[PDB]
Design a protein around this ligand. Sequence first.
Ligand SMILES: O=N[O-]
Ligand SMILES: O=N[O-]
Ligand SMILES: O=N[O-]
Ligand SMILES: [Cu+2]
Ligand SMILES: [Cu+2]
Ligand SMILES: [Cu+2]
Ligand SMILES: [Cu+2]
Ligand SMILES: [Cu+2]
Ligand SMILES: [Cu+2]
Lengths: 337, 341, 339
Amino acid sequence: ATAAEIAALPRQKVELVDPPFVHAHSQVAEGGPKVVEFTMVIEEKKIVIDDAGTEVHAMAFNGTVPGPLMVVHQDDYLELTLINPETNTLMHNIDFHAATGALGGGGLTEINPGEKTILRFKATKPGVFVYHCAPPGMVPWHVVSGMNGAIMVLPREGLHDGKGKALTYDKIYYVGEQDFYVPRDENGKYKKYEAPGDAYEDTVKVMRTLTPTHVVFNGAVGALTGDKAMTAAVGEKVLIVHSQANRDTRPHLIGGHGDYVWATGKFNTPPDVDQETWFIPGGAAGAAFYTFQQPGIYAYVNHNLIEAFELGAAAHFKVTGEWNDDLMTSVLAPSGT
Amino acid sequence: ATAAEIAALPRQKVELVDPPFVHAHSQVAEGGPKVVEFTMVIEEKKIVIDDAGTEVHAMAFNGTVPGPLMVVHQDDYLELTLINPETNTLMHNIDFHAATGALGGGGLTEINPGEKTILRFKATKPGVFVYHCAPPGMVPWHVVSGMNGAIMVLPREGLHDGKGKALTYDKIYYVGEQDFYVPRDENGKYKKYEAPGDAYEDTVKVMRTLTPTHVVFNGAVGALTGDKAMTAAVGEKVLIVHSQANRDTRPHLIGGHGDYVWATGKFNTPPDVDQETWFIPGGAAGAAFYTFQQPGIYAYVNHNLIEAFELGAAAHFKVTGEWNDDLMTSVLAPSGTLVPR
Amino acid sequence: ATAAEIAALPRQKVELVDPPFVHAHSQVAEGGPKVVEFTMVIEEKKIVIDDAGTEVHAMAFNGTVPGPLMVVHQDDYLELTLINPETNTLMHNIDFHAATGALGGGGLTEINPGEKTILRFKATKPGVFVYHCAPPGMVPWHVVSGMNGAIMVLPREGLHDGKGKALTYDKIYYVGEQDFYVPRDENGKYKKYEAPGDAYEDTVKVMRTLTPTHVVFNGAVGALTGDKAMTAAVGEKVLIVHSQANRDTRPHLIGGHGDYVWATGKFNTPPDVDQETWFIPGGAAGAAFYTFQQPGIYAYVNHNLIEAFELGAAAHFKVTGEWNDDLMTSVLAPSGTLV
Ligand SMILES: O=N[O-]
Ligand SMILES: O=N[O-]
Ligand SMILES: O=N[O-]
Ligand SMILES: [Cu+2]
Ligand SMILES: [Cu+2]
Ligand SMILES: [Cu+2]
Ligand SMILES: [Cu+2]
Ligand SMILES: [Cu+2]
Ligand SMILES: [Cu+2]
């Protein structure tokens, strides 16, 4: 498209919402290509990531870890206003893995506290994609302080299976998984600090072990449970988008499956089917579609079960509806032999 | 299917066999859906996992690590009687990743010592799938104590390649890979404990390093070697099911390939072909089909070679038959002069 | 093929070049099956791998880490002369994951210093494949001392997408990624050793932690950056072959994609498309095809960004050509209240 063709397209402003929900959008595009406008404000903030009161100095797009999901259609333009408020201490930027050129946008969006910038890129490839901060010389430190999220670039005709049949979800959730590297003192207790830059050296030492102290969804142990358990009903079709900007993961729905999984996250790569556990490499997003068939509490985990049940990587779905005895029944409930 | 329709189905009782063997089955289903019956007793038992004599309190379905492979066909029902004998100390249950509902059956099968339960599920999706114990609050410790295995839900029509041509194997093996996290003392020697519970706190510390001390097939270093090597002949078609309930692996047949690999384990996902090394994420099973072309000893490994040769993840195949110099020949054997060094 | 037919095939000798470059070849085969002859000399030598002067006693096919890429077509034979010079100290051999039999050739190629051997195998399967040394009983030590590379067995009709359209690259690069395990003393300083065997017990202790001290391309931190960046132009089609003989990696082109990725490395498995980050398990090679669309500097990384930017696994591409403002533009450059 020429600059005059892009000038003539409609603009749409979107209000973002906190993960794991996703802002309003249409699965099939409503209209020709648009320039879709988003704004995120970077907040350097303390987050508490476990029930021992462990703290992280988060570097949080729109104040959440992960940052929020942006949704556009293929060949729309995503136009981001990124703001780095004067109350922050570090320079930040943004790399969209969905984008083409200038290190994903990072080369064009380096903003010191008190600056803003506006980047536009054409979303030429359909899929779910990581975005993350990447300041030269400090890249993994920002990413493993929670400065990452994902976008979804839907095909203009919505999702389809490998054979071209429509897949339409009722619900969509976004699970961002985070590896944290929290320094400990000589007694094994997690250290606290009064500014992000005070933890830097201690944290690089833990990062270089390649062994996270915590692996969590939505920024904390247990965050996607209780008030934030994800909801569905028997018969509803749910898309679960999962990202991990730095480290591999292997998502699994305990008691369910991934009926269709774009494990690579890319919708022109046909999805795998009937998955028990799928694999998303560090630096990517993936998406699984499932139709619930049984009610109950489900857990949703990274299936390194030490990562899930010792280090924090477990969420719940609460699912209403009628039990199906054909699919599963207790013929004899636990009872003396 | 209604309760009445399920009741009218034929029942078949299977006698399980120990890994890496798989109980007798038919590749193509014989007749219509069935309720296929299995029984396993859980044994908490000390096992040795290396030639030094290192000792784990295993938590073993049917007394083996891995637990045995159960084979049914798509839309059969798998009906398991699971028994937790009164000589065990812990509650156990089972989660079938092939099943739908109640945490894969875990929510409906928590048995204390002295209890049994019968779970039935419809095997709706074809593939190989992990199963493992999962007591709430203690899940990884049971699974990395060996309490996991796999099932295979064959399509009713048997296996096919991605273009629909039949793939019929002559033998099958099940390789269960287990990461173990054994505590060490102040000088670096592995510790032994009187009961499973005495090991718990020291074992969780090693688990949280995410670094196994042992990574093994069939429960111990070298278990599938020597008189326990797997075997085949030139021309024979072998399916190798591989599972890992907790941690990634990357299987490889040294001197062979995976001609067709369902790396995800799911038979409605077309298999990769011509693979050197395939990848099975923790929490899953996969399957590779190969036709042997050359005789001799092969190794089958996790191709993190430190895991294979330092931590235990290496098996052998002994293959009989004639050597094929078209496929490979030593044009000049190692030769030269005997030099000082 | 009868014995006289195999004996009558043409023999062609090919000169290797050092990674990340690849020897000249044709994408579509030229003529019928041939026996393609290569020779490699193994060098044991000390290499420096980071800006602190840390040393590895490298075990290097053809004198490089990784060893060079050999390129043949499907149903050619690859006939390698492997030479272990008398100034080396260790026995070595070679396992081609592309080959069938004898542990990939390792059982037929065990050569002490002062020996040579010639192995021929039929390249029956198309794809990129690891090769590595594997002396029984010391396999991971040789591989993590750098003794590994890859080959490419192209289909005779060249590459194609999943629909059958031809995919023809202008350029090809081979990135071999290496995990090293360098012992440290109790102050955290990397240790140095007189002879390669002197480091063996300390190095296996590091190996057993499963945590590399360094993760590098072309054998050293920074080897493919700066003035050693790989190059392309806007409009150019580039195939990037990547291998890792011992440990998983997850390549990513920062500011680009893998337009077609044979993530398994095998050309009869249809490529994934539009990839951000692909995944190559330890013990395999993979290949990504991309057409560059934007000029400027790119980084090409293992996207565990701690492995990329703390442990060494980052390369650059320098790309010439015109900026495309349709694909990306700065609507407002970084700014505070005033311009
Ligand atoms: O089935 N997840 O442990
Ligand atoms: O070729 N297996 O090391
Ligand atoms: O986009 N690589 O960090
Ligand atoms: Cu930042
Ligand atoms: Cu990135
Ligand atoms: Cu148990
Ligand atoms: Cu599970
Ligand atoms: Cu060697
Ligand atoms: Cu190998």
